[PDB]
């Protein structure tokens, strides 16, 4: 049911003191299924998720290889970019990327993805036809010429239209227990008043799996927003998430409404109700 | 312009020291040092992805290397010794381990003792009277022998100019005495031109064999004339008769 | 193992065409490269395949990543194409292949196999025996030691006459042999000249 595998590449570079740090994490739909890191915090404690071990040293050994050779290729990058904009060797800069493919459950490739970002600012991206580039500024135009000549587009597509795909369905198969799964919501609301007449009735949560947990302070029938002071979802630590919104209704028209949630796996909506339960 | 790799040939005595220069123009960040043995595949010794740095592939040996500057990759043999007797290819190219561009290659022969290094004896053979009056053509054969190692270049010169029109030389040299490995070699070439172009005593055919042997700073206490790098060749005129 | 390439010397006729086969154990390999190494020099990039199939221009490259097949196609062969054709697979860190030789044989139109005896220069005839004009079909074998020497064939190309031809050498220091008994270790055709005089 709609699947997407993408990698988040990161070549943050440290100047002189040490070496450039290279991070490459993998996701499937949103499941971090592997993490590589130049700073191997303890011998290969590089998280690998459960359904990738059955891939003998064969897969991981070949995979761990690709990483190194890439980190060497984005060593060049970091120093070319520094050259394009002419920046001292003293500074520290960042090269990020997201490449991965989305497919329909039937197994066919819908779109290809591959973007880069230097210092946080989009630099160059592979277009939707997977055969052209879209340069941000005049520097990336230098890169573009480079890859147009190098046929780099072709190479990236070859991957996204093959290995990327031919390993997505596979990752979904082997690890179906976690990928094509859901999770129990759990959202214990709370009262908690404050000063005079303007109080608060924030909900809460124990998490789920994604985070699209839509906590809206409704208002009769029209989705209320202004009367809301909601804060961003701040995971939790036990591999779950939270979030809470803070409605400020009077002590006379208090429970003139109840907060909802809505989720994934669960069949019909679980329209919640604020009321000491 | 291109990927230059010097020198072409070089003779070493075990324990001596030499260093191969591989310099490039294309501004490639990536360079390589490969070793290839007769009939054997391409072997990676070291590589450098930048103006510093260096790596593996097949290092545990008398190979070290430096990328001081970016234009050139130097391969140094501290204390030489067999193996290390082979043909080396340095290569570069933008992109990490993708398309690459090799230089001419360096043919290295390090010997336990330079007593068996010997310059080539060249000879030319005038065509066949039969062939001429049969095929209306004319073939000249050239034969260089007794040379070691096999570090030579063969070429025909007519009227002083080089010529490839109707030329052909043995792909590899021939091991005269295949009884022992460290045996001398021998080479042959053919040059065929029309009969009416032959029997005119106004044309100068010249088969020439360039030999790459020993330099100067090599102790040579043998009575011989010391197998220096030189030119051995033989000439032949248009024997109208 | 790793990269599995073709067997040995393939002797494709001139105008004809040739296809090579290369295979890889690592199914998840990436880019491929057909290099060309003229005995005896440096590999020169010929074809590169980052996708499924690449042309340009007289050389074709078919890549099925599913069956793990990468092929080279050389139509309208020239006698020059003759060389060892390395196959290189990237994926991970660029592994070279042993290679696949390839000798394009010419079309000896007017063959008249013969074995003359070019005199020599100068003293002591080293008895050079020129086997030539034998059609590319006929092959020549090796000889012996003692004091005689042979050399495998070799093609000419008198481009100033658009005529190609074969040749082979056989010399020695007076054993003493001649022309009729020099190439006595091969399969001679039915018209080979042996002019005694």
């Amino acid at each position: 049911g709609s699947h997407s595998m993408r990698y988040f590449d990161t070549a943050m570079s440290r100047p002189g003191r040490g070496e450039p740090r290279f991070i490459s994490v993998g996701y499937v739909d949103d499941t971090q299924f592997v993490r590589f890191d130049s700073d191997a915090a303890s011998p290969r404690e590089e998280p690998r998720a459960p359904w990738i071990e059955q891939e003998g040293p064969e897969y991981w050994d070949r995979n761990t290889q690709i990483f190194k050779t890439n980190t060497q290729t984005d060593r060049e990058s970091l120093r070319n970019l520094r050259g394009y904009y002419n920046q001292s060797e003293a500074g520290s800069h960042t090269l990020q990327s997201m490449y991965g493919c989305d497919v329909g459950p039937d197994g066919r490739l819908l779109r290809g993805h591959n973007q880069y970002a230097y210092d946080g600012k989009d630099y160059i991206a592979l277009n939707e036809d997977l055969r052209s580039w879209t340069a941000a500024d005049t520097a990336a135009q230098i890169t573009q010429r480079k890859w147009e000549a190098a046929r780099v587009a072709e190479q990236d597509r070859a991957y996204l239209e093959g290995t990327c795909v031919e390993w997505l369905r596979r990752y979904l198969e082997n690890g179906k227990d976690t990928l094509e799964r859901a999770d129990p919501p759990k959202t214990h609301v709370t009262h908690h008043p404050i000063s005079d007449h303007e109080a608060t009735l924030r909900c809460w949560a124990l998490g789920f799996y994604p985070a699209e947990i839509t906590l809206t302070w409704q208002r009769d029938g029209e989705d209320q927003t202004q009367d809301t002071e909601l804060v961003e979802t701040r995971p939790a630590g036990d591999r779950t998430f939270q979030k809470w919104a803070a409605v400020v209704v009077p002590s006379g028209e208090e429970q003139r409404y109840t907060c909802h949630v809505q989720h994934e796996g669960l069949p019909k909506p679980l329209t919640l109700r604020w009321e000491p339960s | 312009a291109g990927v230059t790799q010097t020198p072409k040939f070089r003779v070493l005595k075990t324990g001596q020291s030499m260093t191969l220069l591989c310099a490039q123009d294309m501004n490639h960040e990536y360079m390589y040092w490969y070793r290839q043995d007769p009939g054997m595949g391409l072997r990676l010794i070291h590589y450098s992805v930048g103006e510093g740095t260096t790596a593996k592939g097949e290092v545990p040996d008398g190979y070290n290397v430096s990328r001081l500057k970016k234009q050139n990759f130097l391969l140094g043999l501290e204390s030489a010794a067999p193996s290390q007797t082979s043909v080396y290819f340095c290569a570069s190219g933008q992109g990490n381990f993708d398309i690459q561009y090799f230089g001419a290659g360096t043919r290295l022969s390090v010997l336990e003792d330079l007593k068996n290094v010997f310059p080539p004896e060249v000879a030319v053979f005038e065509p066949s009277e039969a062939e001429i009056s049969h095929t209306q053509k004319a073939t000249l054969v050239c034969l260089a022998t007794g040379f070691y190692p096999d570090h030579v270049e063969l070429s025909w010169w007519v009227n002083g100019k080089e010529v490839h029109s109707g030329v052909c030389t043995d792909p590899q040299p021939l091991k005269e005495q295949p009884a022992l490995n460290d045996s001398r070699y021998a080479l042959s070439s053919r040059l065929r031109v029309s009969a009416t172009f032959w029997q005119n005593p106004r044309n100068h055919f010249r088969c020439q064999v360039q030999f790459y042997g020993l330099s100067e700073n090599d102790e040579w206490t043998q009575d011989r004339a010391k197998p220096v790098t030189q030119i051995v060749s033989a000439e032949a005129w248009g024997r109208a008769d | 193992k790793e990269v599995e390439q073709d067997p040995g010397p393939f002797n494709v006729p001139e105008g004809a065409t040739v296809a090579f086969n290369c295979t890889y154990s690592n199914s998840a390999s990436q880019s491929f490269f057909w290099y060309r190494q003229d005995s005896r020099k440096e590999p020169k990039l010929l074809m590169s395949v980052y996708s499924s199939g690449n042309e340009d221009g007289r050389f074709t490259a078919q890549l099925n990543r599913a069956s793990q097949y990468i092929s080279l196609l050389i139509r309208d062969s020239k006698l020059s194409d003759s060389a060892t054709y390395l196959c290189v697979v990237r994926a991970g860190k660029l592994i070279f292949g042993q290679g696949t030789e390839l000798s394009v044989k010419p079309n000896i139109q007017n063959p008249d196999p013969a074995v003359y005896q070019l005199r020599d220069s100068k003293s002591s005839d080293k008895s050079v025996c020129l086997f030539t004009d034998f059609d590319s079909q006929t092959n020549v074998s090796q000889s012996k030691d003692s004091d005689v020497y042979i050399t495998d064939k070799c093609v000419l190309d008198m481009r100033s006459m658009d005529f190609k031809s074969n040749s082979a050498v056989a010399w020695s220091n007076k054993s003493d042999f001649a022309c009729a008994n020099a190439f006595n270790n091969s399969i001679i055709p039915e018209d080979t000249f042996f002019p005694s005089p």
Partner: peptide, 9 residues
């Protein structure tokens, strides 16, 4: 499975 990025920006 990672992508083999051979060319830098």
């Amino acid at each position: 499975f990672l992508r083999g990025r051979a060319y830098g920006l």
